[PDB]
């Protein structure tokens, strides 16, 4: 139906230029211009403007008009925003969503985000930890496991417990920045008949570093 | 520029039962309000436009409404995966400027923690550095404090908080409280302790550990 998927999230040090592309879908490209939204972290909402897909002329939003640049690529009917000289505070995640009529005042259908973190930070892998307990059954007859996924930079990690099958019972606790990297972390619980009989695994992907782990979190007690 | 206003910020109401977003303008914008919900981890997604039309598909329990300068936007028979961030933007006159946001807290019945003290890993350990990693599970309501403790000495410094946001299937939270530490300050000391004060009772929980077999 319509869809838009828009680029993987980019790590850009202060200073330089991100095109970000918005590749739409499902619907005719030259008859619905585009929105570009900021979601900051802290903040909420903010319309950065809209672009004519058919004249191609852009209304910039005053907070913008200048360090941003929207185009399109209208024979791949994709939309692009890019930011030139990025200024930390442009971290983000930047949204693309269809003007429903011209000038956008309804974005219906909106697109994934694309996250911009503009950091002088050096790429880190992560160091993957398998979090066995000191025995300790947690609650009626589960246990529960963990994975410390730690030091790396920047996000994101992709932590699944046992490629994906270990659904239910998890819990993968938020990434938090100590400062320079970044540490996360998951839980998962499991009845008894489960561990350590069938093999639990954490397998952690950093494709930053282009890092792929699989840990067994095997009894250590 | 029109500025809309969302006061308040947070919102709690339990399941099936109603609640009422309020959005307001700073002059006669004339019904031209969009209510978008923003589901924790996804897009927004449109509900409703020109104060009170859905858009393909948002069921009937939401009702959009208002006029002049107030609008609301109300949800009924709330479903635990209601919970979400809650805008307006306006749809009048250019630029097209949004609320602060309201987010839809599930109230829940009590839930006590699930606390689970974990010891550094031997490869962690290898590499010098030690790290008690304690687990609150599934736990209503949100506040939950937890102290370190090594050797009865409260440790109050090198510990990282983070909290998962409320679950959309239970309507409960969860923490993972990590303590950082030396390996050689580790070995300097034996008794490790996760101990939490929630609601729940009265006599903290409180978890504690050190290697021995099972």
Redesign the interface.
């Given at each position: 139906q319509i869809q838009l998927v828009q680029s993987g999230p980019e790590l850009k040090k202060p200073g330089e230029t991100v095109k970000i592309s918005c590749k739409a879908s499902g619907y005719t490209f030259t008859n619905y211009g585009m929105n570009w939204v900021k979601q900051a972290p802290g903040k909420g909402l903010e319309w950065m403007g809209w672009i004519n897909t058919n004249t191609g002329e852009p209304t910039y939003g005053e907070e913008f008009k200048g360090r941003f640049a929207f185009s399109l690529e209208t024979s791949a009917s994709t939309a692009n925003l890019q930011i030139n000289n990025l200024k930390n505070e442009d971290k983000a995640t930047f949204f693309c969503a269809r003007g429903e009529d011209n000038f956008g005042s309804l974005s219906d259908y909106w697109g994934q985000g694309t996250t911009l973190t503009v950091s002088s930070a050096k790429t880190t892998a992560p160091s993957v930890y398998p979090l066995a307990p000191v025995c300790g059954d947690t609650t009626g007859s589960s246990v529960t496991l963990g994975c410390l996924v730690k030091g790396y930079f920047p996000e994101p990690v992709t932590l699944t417990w046992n490629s994906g099958s270990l659904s239910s019972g998890v819990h993968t606790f938020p990434a938090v920045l100590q400062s320079d990297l970044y540490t996360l972390s998951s839980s998962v619980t499991v009845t008894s008949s489960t561990w350590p009989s069938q093999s639990i695994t954490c397998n952690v992907a950093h494709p930053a570093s282009s890092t792929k782990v699989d840990k067994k979190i095997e009894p250590r007690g | 520029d029109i500025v809309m206003t969302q006061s308040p910020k947070f919102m709690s109401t339990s399941v099936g039962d109603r609640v009422t977003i309020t959005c307001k303008a700073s002059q006669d914008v004339s019904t031209?309000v969009?209510w978008?919900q923003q589901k924790p981890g996804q897009?927004?997604?449109?509900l409703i436009?020109w104060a009170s039309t859905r858009?393909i598909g948002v069921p009937d329990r939401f009702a959009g409404s208002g006029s002049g300068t107030d609008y609301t936007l109300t949800i009924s028979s709330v479903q635990a995966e209601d919970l979400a961030?809650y805008?307006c933007?306006q749809?009048?006159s250019?630029?097209?400027?949004?609320?602060?946001?309201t987010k839809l807290e599930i109230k829940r019945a009590d839930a006590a923690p699930?606390v689970?003290?974990?010891?550094p890993?031997?490869?962690?350990l290898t590499?010098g550095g030690a790290?008690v990693?304690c687990?609150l599970?599934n736990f209503y309501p949100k506040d939950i404090n937890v102290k370190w403790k090594i050797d009865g000495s409260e440790r109050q410094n090198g510990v990282?908080?983070?909290?998962?946001?409320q679950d959309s299937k239970d309507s409960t939270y969860?923490?993972?409280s990590?303590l950082?530490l030396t390996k050689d300050e580790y070995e300097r000391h034996n008794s490790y302790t996760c101990e939490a004060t929630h609601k729940t009772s009265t006599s903290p929980i409180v978890?504690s550990?050190?290697?021995?077999?099972?």
């Open positions: - | 031209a969009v978008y897009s927004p997604k449109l436009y858009h961030l805008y933007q749809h009048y250019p630029p097209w400027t949004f609320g602060g946001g699930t689970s003290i974990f010891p890993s031997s490869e962690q590499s790290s990693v687990f599970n990282l908080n983070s909290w998962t946001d969860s923490m993972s990590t950082t978890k550990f050190n290697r021995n077999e099972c």
